[PDB]
Design a protein around this ligand. Structure first.
Ligand SMILES: Cc1sc2c(c1C)C(c1ccc(Cl)cc1)=N[C@@H](CC(=O)Nc1nncs1)c1nnc(C)n1-2
Length: 127
């Protein structure tokens, strides 16, 4: 069994910038989700080998996790807030695609997603 390489977190070929919105995504959004009691499954890529999930990376072809997002934000990898919001949405959606309704991990994702929605609702206007 083998895991894929993780999503990239650095690429000199990719345009990037700092924006006040991206700063909020790190300081408010990421930080709020990261400290949550239910964050831990999402703090790093799914280890399909150790979890014995050999079909995971057949079903989930665009993996994403908050460890990757955190590094992307700390590295200023993004051009805009939408790119980062899309990564969060991919992460939640992947969990719902792979798992069953009412599974613990789905309840965890829902708790994080509720906070994510609350925080992104107050994403500042771009400066
Ligand atoms: C470190 C990680 S990452 C992760 C998980 C763990 C431990 C777990 C998980 C399970 C319960 C709780 Cl309380 C918390 C987490 N769920 C897997 C799916 C899975 O294991 N399905 C199975 N089907 N029967 C046998 S195991 C999963 N799906 N997305 C993510 C992200 N995970």
């Amino acid at each position: 069994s083998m895991n894929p390489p993780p999503p990239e977190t650095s690429n000199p070929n990719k345009p990037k910038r700092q924006t006040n919105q991206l700063q909020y995504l790190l300081r408010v959004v990421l930080k709020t989700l990261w400290k949550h009691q239910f964050a831990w499954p999402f703090q790093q890529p799914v280890d399909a080998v150790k979890l014995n999930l050999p079909d995971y990376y057949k079903i989930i072809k665009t993996p994403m996790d908050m460890g990757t997002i955190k590094k992307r934000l700390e590295n200023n990898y993004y051009w805009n807030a939408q790119e980062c919001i899309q990564d969060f949405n991919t992460m939640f959606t992947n969990c719902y695609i792979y798992n069953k309704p009412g599974d613990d991990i789905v309840l965890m994702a829902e708790a994080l997603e509720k906070l994510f929605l609350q925080k992104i609702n107050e994403l500042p206007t771009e400066e």
